[PDB]
Every structure is written in C-alpha cells, then in structure tokens.
Symmetry: C4
Subunit: 301 residues, 4 copies
C-alpha cells in the first residue's frame, strides 16, 4: 500500500489520471487517510513548509532584482554594493528559473501525460513551467541586445507572484479556497468570458462603425471605452463625432443593460449556486492535492 | 414515429404551440431523448458545425465591409473591390435570411400569438434582416440613415450568434438561462427601476431653475449614471435649497443603487437555484427542434 | 363573508389587526380565497384598472413642472393657451391632493386605527397621506409669498411618484415582487442603514478631526467625500491639507475595508438568503393585500 | 445554580474557555434560558440601557472637544472653557476604561491564548484606551503625533458602539454575524487578494521606467483603486510595450474585480445560509454573560 518498489495503492490512486471515475472517493478509505494524514504531519509538511520558505525567499530576491533594473543590454557592473546585490539577485533568480524549467521537463518525461487536456489537469506544474519559460526567454533576449527582455521579466514577475498560491495547500480552509477559485475560473469565468467577449466585441464593432472620426475611431479605442463600463467607469459621453445621438445613446444603453445589469449579476448568482453545490467535491479534490503532495515529497526524499 | 410521412410524434411534440402543458418534459422518455441525441450524433451536429462556420465567416465579412464605409450615397483599386464585394455578400446574406424568415412564417403559419412567445431567434433574425434591407433601400435612396440601420443590424447580428451556442450542453444551458433571466427578472427590475428613475428625474428637473440639465433628457441621463458607479452627486449648483437637492439625490441612490440594484442579484440567485431542470429540458427541446429542422431541410 | 354582513368573514379577516397570530393564512382559506377571486374579476378588478388609469393621468397632469414652473408667488396669467393649461393643471393637482388628504383623514376616523403598527403594516396609506400633506403645505407656501413651495411640491411629486408602486399591485408577479421590496426595505435596509451610519459617521468624524484646514474642514464635506465611496466614486486623495499622510491613508483604507468590501456584500448575502426563505409568505401577504384592496372597492362600489 | 461563591453552573458556562466542545448550546436548555431572560427583564436590561446612554454621551463629549481642537502643544471664553472641560472628561473616560481593562485582565487571569481568541470586545476597548493615554502623553510631551493618536482613538470609539448592540435580538445577531464574517471570509479574501495585488503592482512598477508612478506606494494605490470601481487603465504612458502594460492591467482586473469579489460574495452567502443557529447561540451567550457580569458588578 505505501512502499512496494513496483507499485503501491497510494501511488496508483494519487497519480491516477482523471479518467478514473471515483479518483476523489478512492482516498477517504480509513487506512489511506490515516496513513496520508500521518505522512502529512510526519515529513511531507516539514519538506512542504521549508520549501515554501525557500520559494518565498526566491520570489523576494527575484522582485528585488527586477525592481532595481538599471535604465540596449547587456550592461556593465558599476562599483557599488547595490550593483553587486542586484547582479547576484538576478543571477540567483535566473538560476531558480532554470531549475524550475528542468523540474518541469523531468515531470513531462517521467509522468508522460497522454496529450489529453493536460492544461486543466495538473495545471499547477504547467503554470510553473510557463514561469520558468518566461524567465529563460527573458535571459536569451537580454543577451540578444533587445528590450523585450523587460516585457518578459514583468510577465515572469507577474506569473511567480500569482502562482505563489500553490503553497496554500497544507492548510485546510486556505486549500479549499484555492481549489474552489481554480474550478470557478475553469467553469463560471470561462463561460461568462466567452459570452461577454461576443457582446462587448459586437456592440463595440457597431459603435466604431457608427462613429465618424476622432481619437475613438479605432476599434481598439472603442472596445476600451465599452470595457470601461464593466469596472464602474462607463462614461456615456466619451465621443460626439457622430451624426446621430439617438443611435449612439440607444446602442450604449442596450450594451449597458445587456452586459453590466444582466451578465455580471447573473454571474454572481451562478457563482453562489456553484459555491452552494460543491463543499464535499472541493474537500475531496483538496484531499487529492495534499495526498499527491505527501507522495511527491516521499519520492523527493 | 420519425419517418411516417403522415404525422410524426417527434414533430407533434416539437412543433406543438406553448399551449401543450408538457412539450418540454415529455421528450425525456427513453425513446424520444435517445432518438434525438442520436439524430444529433448522426446528421445534425456536423450539419450545425458547418452552418455556424458559414454564419461566422459571413459576420466577419459584414464587419470588415461596414468598418471601412467611405464618408449622400450611393458611393478603381483592390481595396474598393474587396469592400464592394463584401457589401454585396452582406446584402446577399441579409436577403437570404429575409426569405428564410418569410418561409418559416408561411410554413409554420403561426397563430398570430406564438410569434411573440415562441422562437425568439426567428423573430430576432427577421428583424436583423429587415434592418439590413432598410439600410439597403435608404442607401440607394440618397440618405445618411443607411449607416444608422446598418450599425443597428450589425449590433443585432453580432448578438444573434448566441443562437448557435445550442449544440453545446453547457453553453446552450447558459443561453437558455440568459433568455429566462431577461424574460422575468430583468423585465420586473426595468419596470420598477424606470418608474423610480422617471419620478426622481422629474423631481430634480423641477427643483432646478436655469442650468445645463434643465432638459429632462440630460437630468435623466445624470440620474441613470448613478447605476453604473459613475454618479456625480454635485453635477449642478445653479439652484436654491441645497438641502432639498441633496436629500432628493440621497433618497434616489438608496431606493435604487442601494436597494433595487442589489434586489436584482438576490432574485437572480433564487431563480437560478430553481430553474436548472427546466433550463436543461428547454435546451433539449431547442436541440430536438434543430434536429427536426435539419431533417426537413433535406 | 360565509353568510354574514355586520362582521362578514372576508371583511374581518382582511381588516384584521397586527396582533392576530396567523392572519396570513386566513384569506388563503380555499372558500375565502375564492370570495376575493370570483369577486376580484367580478367588478373590483374593473374598478381597480380604471382607478389606476385615473391616478396615472392625475400624476402626469402634475409631473410636467418643467413646463409649468415660472421663474415671489403668487404669479400672473399670461393670457395664452400654455398658461391656461398650466393653471388648469395646477388647480387639478391641488384639488386631487385635497381629495387624497380628505380620503386619508376619512380612513383615520372610520378605522380609528392603532396608528402604531400603521407605519409597518398598511404603511401605503401613510405615504399617500404624506404626499397629500406636502401638497397642502405647498399650496399655503405658494399663497404665503415664500419660495419653499418649490421644495415642498418637488418632494410631493417624488413622494407620489414612489407611491405609483402601490397601484403596481393587482398582478401576481409584480405585486409579490413589490412585496419583497416592501419587506426588504423594512428589515435588511434598516439594519444595514443603522450599522453603516454609525461606521460612516465615526470615520468622517476621525477624518475631519485629522484634517487641519481646507474646503473639506467642514464635517458635512468630509462626510460626503467618505460617502462617495459607497457609490463607486471614492477618491482616496480628496483632501491635501490634513495631518501627516501616515494617518489619513490608513484610516481611509480601514473605512473602505469595513464598509465597502464588507457591509454591502453582507447586505447582498442577507437579502439573498432572505429571498430564499420568503416565497409562500410573500404570496400569502400579496393575497391578503388584494383581498383588502378589492374589499375597499366593494365598500366604495 | 446561581452562586455558591466557589463554583456555579451559570459562571461555569459563562467563564469556561472556548476549548469546551459545545459552550454555545448549553444555555439552550429550559432552566438556564428562562432564568437568564427573567434576570435580564428584571434589572440587567434597565442597567444595560443606562450604561449605553452614558457611553453615547461620553463619546459625543470627547468627539466635540477633538473636532474643535486649536491648530507646539500644549496650549477666558465660554467655548475654550467648554473645550478644556470636554477634554478633561474625555481623558477621565479613557482612564476609566484603562482601569476596567486592567481589572478584567487581572481577574480573568487569561492563559495568553484565549486573550487574543475571545473577549475581542474587551481587547478593542483597551486598545482605544491605550491610544488615548499615549495621546495624552504626546500632548504633554510637546509633539504633534497626539492628533494622530486622538483621531485613531476617536475612530475606534465610534466603531465600538457595536458592543452595546447586544441586548437587542436583531442588532445582536447582525453584530455577531459581522464578527464571524470578518474572522473568516474577509481575512482569507484579504490574504489572497493582497498576494495578487503585490504581484501585479511589482510587475507594473517594474514595467515603468520613470515618473511619479515609479514608486511602489503610488502604483500600488493605483492598482488598489480598481477594486472600488474607480480604475483608470490609462494612469501612465511613460514606458514602452503598451501591449505589455494593457495585458498586465487586463489580467489583474479579470483576476480580482470579476472573479475574487464575486467569489467573496458567494462564500459570504454560503456562510450566512449556514450560520443562523450558531449566530443566535453566540448572541445568547453574549447576553447571558452580560446578565452574569451585571450580577457580579453589584
Ligand atoms: C423579439 C426578440 C426578443 C428577443 C428577447 C429574448 C432573447 C432570448 O431570450 O434569446 C433569443 C433567442 C433564443 O430563444 P429561442 O427561440 O431559441 O427559444 C424559443 C422558445 O423560448 C422555447 O425555448 C422553444 O420554443 C425554443 O427554444 C424556441 O422556440 O435567440 C438567442 O438566443 C439570441 C438572443 C441574443 C440576445 C439578444 C436578445 C435581444 C436582441 C438584442 C438587440 C441588440 C440591438 C443592437
Ligand atoms: C484585536 C482587535 C480586533 C478584535 C477582533 C474584532 C472583534 C469584532 O469585530 O467583533 C466585535 C467585538 C465582539 O467581540 P466578543 O468579545 O464579543 O467575542 C466573543 C466574546 O468574547 C465571547 O467570549 C464569545 O462570544 C466568543 O468566545 C468571543 O468571540 O467587539 C464588539 O463588541 C463590537 C465592537 C466593534 C468594533 C470592532 C471592529 C474594529 C473597529 C476598527 C476601528 C479602527 C479605527 C481606526
Ligand atoms: C501569461 C499570463 C499573463 C502574464 C502577466 C500577468 C500575470 C497573470 C498570472 C496568471 C496566472 C495566475 C492565475 C493562476 O492560475 O494561479 C494559480 C495559483 O492559484 C497557484 O495555485 P495552484 O498550485 O495551481 O493550485
Ligand atoms: C421627505 C424625504 C424626501 C421626499 C422625496 C420623496 C421620494 C423619496 C422616497 C420616498 C419614500 C420611498 C419609499 C416609497 O415611497 O415606496 C412606497 C411604495 O412601496 C408604494 O408601494 P406600497 O403601497 O407600499 O405597496
Ligand atoms: Na465606479
Ligand atoms: Na462600481
């Protein structure tokens, strides 16, 4: 069940592909929970909370190196203690980013997923590989004498900080919150974004055709003006370069009614219904997270 | 049952008017649901995937042609050739939809009553096609309203793509849920909110003596602004009794922005909590009607 | 009525006092529910749709104060078709207001009500009487050579405009929807308004005490600046001349977190769960309101 | 049951730490409930109404003296003499609360764990008293930080009236509901959203090259402003890769405004739909302890 050198119940159930029907109810078994929870309070938490500190320090050094970037590259090293700190910090952030890149490649070679929607499945590792990729593509451009390295560095800085949530596991309520938001993005945000993108683009495509000329005669500008409504900034007077105010006002009011007053509230209702439906489901998938984490550190050491 | 050439239960349950108590639920029996989901997996799903592709390309061509309209119509180079070809193809799609709507009306020959309670999609497409034709005739009639009817036709046409979201279980249910919310909750909210909006706008306009919003339209727009989190609360100072103005503005906000606006969320939540089952059944019926529509086309 | 007149069954159960334990399931009695349903459409509904039209036309005859209001009253007659319309509309509105005043007084005398649960229950007629009182004091202000008549009549117009929601009843969905807005303003909007007022008064008092001098040194100005956060307009830097920024920023963030991020969402959740609990009782109370409304038409026709 | 001067079941329930498995449901029994309600109605209730009146009067006196403070402290007129006596009466109230907190801390002999897990109300009062005392010290110590201390104390004093909402069934349930929501939902949301906001602020500031939005504080405030529905999306233009700037803003907005806040509104709704009995039982415990405390006071 725990150690066999060939195959173990914990290994097959924790590492089981999603195709298994009850992979979330195959771990509540009395001995399996007592063993996994033991392993959680035995080693895996000691390796999960020491590694958490290491990653936090890595992200604090990576944000120190990025913020203090000097203003084409590469650059020289000024004789200053601050410059030395910056140079060691960026060298250490790049090293960590190539370490994550190797960990991801090892994960791909070893587990060998079936090229079947592996983006929703084990999405934590694919995100960590995207961050390592953002760091190593920020390294080659920087040595290639181009300023797109900063665009890449801000994206790697914005990918690491948001992915910090990976360590929310090990804490019951905080893990249940993380898994609940994750599946909510995979469900409520995806559908709402599809329909909202259709309405926003179409209503913004009808305005830009109606508008004659000006700062807002571009499709991008009109889309931005139309989007400003969702964030409580709708102006309703941003342009007067049109022959027909009735046609503009009718279109803008229709867009507001269709999106702001109907879709957002209907989304808040759907999020309430979904939240009321999945307490047990979110506990069982959270139980699958910590359980895999237990075996992951049990194999790391 | 499915091919009898006299009367098919599939057609009887599908083309039944809203009168029938159990037009949605009766289709879930072992034979009807399994026969329709099969028809979807046989010669409807892929016939509906190509049709949607064609309608997406048509909508892209119509947007590209309209987005570049030159500035009293009617109005050589590769760009102008492409623009005129796109305009012609857009007109050709509009007229095709117009004949399709006419054919639907003549065949189904509605009872004069279900055209407003059933198949909102057909009515929505016919109105889009009518806007398109009004935009053609006005364009050839030496008038600039051709661009007003055109932008409305494009705004309605872009919104009509939700008709094709059926064929997908989650997105179809999503569309049916939007349809029901708009029909019930948005209608009630709009009635009660409009009564409030009008009453307090007429009250504020009356308070103002001589200013920039004396016009009822400007003040109505100002009071509507508060609903989208862009309210001013100090838009005017050219009046007397500042206490009366501020009290009137604080009364309105609470009754709508802080009471009826949040009331729309609770009712939406209640409804969504109650209409999952019927929303799935209606999607199934829309899918079954599309299946029998794809079969009768031949 | 179940065969009795002096104290008819449907008369007493409809005109029951507040202290009655279960008045809500009285008119729903199948027989008593078919007394105000077979009679509902008999005549009272025809006299309730005519009265609704008569009140709408009355309201609109006075809602055009934009067109009427001249720029030290009383005023002169301009000898035109517009001024004639204005004066006849004013007279008609003043007469209808007197009519609603005399109706309210005649209700207070005939019913000799408790006038303590008359503001929580049967509060509709209280609002109508308030509308009639504001009209009366508007006429006296206009005749007493004062400019406060414009404020009184503008409050009366808004008071009578909100009251149209009374005649919104008679339709099952709309009346029960107004019943939910009626019971949600009594309980939830009261409790939230009481806790938000204490919070907003306290933080405004702290902010104005911190502010050293400026156009916002007034308590009223700072209170308004603090309130503007609720409607999605918070500036977070409205003042400049105040105590060291160290204290002004922390106070504003605390106010935002406590009021915008916490109490409005708490109000939404509370009105969601309440809406989930109040279907049958909202239908029954709507039935009680129609039973009394049509009983009033039965006694007045 | 009432008092044996060594141990009574009433004091046993009221003074036991939160460690007890079911300290909230013990008062639900008939005898304890009826006896505690009767005691309340008899005297404790009238004793709690006068006590709140005194606090309301006190807060106003201190507030009035603080609002009209003269503008190098420290510092013959009816206003000045009123302002100096109000300050004296405010300093006298702060001292009284200080001594009450010390007495409650020395009597309960807290085990240093439930001190910051329970009696949150007792803790809030001692903190507002400490700021008042440090305000007096600074005032007489020739410093201008007494204003900062006084405004903090004034804010806490105005927000602490929620301690006198107990004694009222609806205002007591609402106040415990707000307590539990702040204890769990607000804290978890704040943790996650602070992580997000720090990440995206550090990404945006690292994208800018120079300007008055180059500092972390201003750019962090700018990113925070989106949550209150007053976002800009065009706050700065002194940088490169406008695509990178707009993508980073649109990702932050999608993550926080349209996903995190609604997520919080759903979780809140769940908890409210779940806590009714616990909130009622905790308010009853706040009321029973109050009756027991009034009996102990004299
Ligand atoms: C007059 C038009 C009023 C449109 C308001 C309602 C919008 C809406 O509910 O859906 C509309 C429709 C989906 O109903 P359907 O026809 O399929 O359902 C019916 C019927 O109800 C039942 O279910 C079955 O018999 C079977 O399903 C079918 O018989 O088609 C869409 O989904 C696109 C609608 C997209 C939203 C736009 C609606 C309003 C038009 C926007 C105008 C823009 C102006 C610029
Ligand atoms: C540390 C400072 C922060 C404290 C946490 C916030 C506390 C809060 O919010 O609950 C209101 C609180 C009531 O706690 P209680 O004592 O009743 O807790 C109970 C009680 O002790 C009893 O044992 C059992 O019920 C149970 O075991 C126990 O849990 O205190 C009030 O009575 C309202 C006061 C409301 C003020 C609190 C909000 C903070 C204001 C910030 C002002 C900033 C100014 C700048
Ligand atoms: C490449 C995207 C744009 C880059 C610039 C902006 C930064 C956007 C960051 C998007 C990723 C954040 C969303 C996300 O997916 O977070 C996951 C975290 O919960 C980690 O928890 P877990 O381990 O996966 O359980
Ligand atoms: C004097 C204060 C400002 C006066 C301005 C008048 C407009 C401000 C709002 C007045 C009160 C709003 C509440 C209200 O008027 O609702 C009543 C409706 O439910 C009527 O329906 P119903 O009879 O109760 O069923
Ligand atoms: Na806003
Ligand atoms: Na807003």
């Amino acid at each position: 069940i725990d150690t066999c050198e060939k195959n173990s119940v914990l290994e097959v159930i924790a590492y089981s592909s999603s195709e298994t029907p009850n992979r979330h109810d195959m771990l509540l078994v009395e001995p399996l929970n007592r063993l996994l929870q033991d392993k959680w309070d035995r080693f895996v938490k000691r390796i999960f909370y020491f590694n958490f500190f290491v990653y936090c320090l890595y992200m604090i050094i990576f944000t120190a190196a990025a913020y203090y970037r000097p203003v084409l590259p590469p650059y020289k090293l000024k004789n200053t203690v601050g410059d030395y700190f910056r140079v060691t910090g960026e060298i250490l952030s790049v090293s960590g980013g190539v370490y994550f890149f190797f960990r991801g490649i090892q994960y791909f070679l070893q587990r060998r997923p079936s090229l079947k929607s592996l983006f929703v499945d084990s999405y934590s590792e694919i995100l960590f590989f995207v961050q390592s990729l953002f760091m190593l593509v920020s390294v080659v451009l920087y040595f290639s004498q181009r300023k797109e390295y900063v665009a890449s560095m801000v994206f790697s800085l914005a990918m690491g900080w948001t992915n910090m949530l990976y360590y929310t596991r090990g804490f019951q309520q905080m893990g249940i919150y993380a898994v609940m938001i994750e599946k909510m993005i995979l469900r409520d945000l995806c559908r709402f974004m599809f329909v909202y993108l259709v309405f926003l683009f179409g209503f913004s495509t009808a305005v830009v055709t109606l508008i004659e000329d000006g700062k807002y005669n571009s499709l991008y500008s009109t889309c931005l003006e139309l989007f400003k409504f969702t964030i409580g900034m709708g102006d309703l007077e941003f342009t007067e370069n049109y022959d027909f105010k009735a046609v503009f006002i009718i279109l803008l009011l229709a867009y507001v009614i269709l999106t702001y007053i109907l879709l957002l509230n209907m989304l808040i209702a759907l999020m309430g219904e979904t939240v009321n439906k999945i307490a047990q489901e979110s506990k069982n998938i959270w139980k699958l997270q910590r359980a895999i984490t237990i075996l992951d550190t049990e194999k790391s050491f």
